[PDB]
Amino acid sequence: GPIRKVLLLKEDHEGLGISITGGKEHGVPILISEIHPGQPADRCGGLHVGDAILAVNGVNLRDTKHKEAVTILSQQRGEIEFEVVYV
C-alpha cells in the first residue's frame, strides 16, 4: 500500500501507545500489533494494526532486530513522525 507519514505528539510521561512484533531475526517487518486505548497513537490517529514501521523521526528501522527497534521507538520524544505502510 501507500507509504504514509504520520505525526504523533506526546509528553515525556506518556508512551507511544503501541505494541509491536517483528524484526530482522524474525524475517518480518516491525509491525503494529495493538493500538492502546487513550494513549497518543489512539488519540492522534493515523496508525493502524498491521502497519509496518519503516522509519521514525528519520531513523531507518529496516533490518533492525526486534529489541533495537523497540529501543529506537521508545527514545523518540515530543514530535514523532512515523513512516508507515500496510502491505
Binding site: 509491536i20 517483528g22 529489541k67
Partner: peptide, 7 residues
C-alpha cells in the same frame, strides 16, 4: 506467537 513489545 511472535514476541511482542509495548512502547
Amino acid at each position: 506467537r511472535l514476541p511482542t513489545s509495548k512502547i
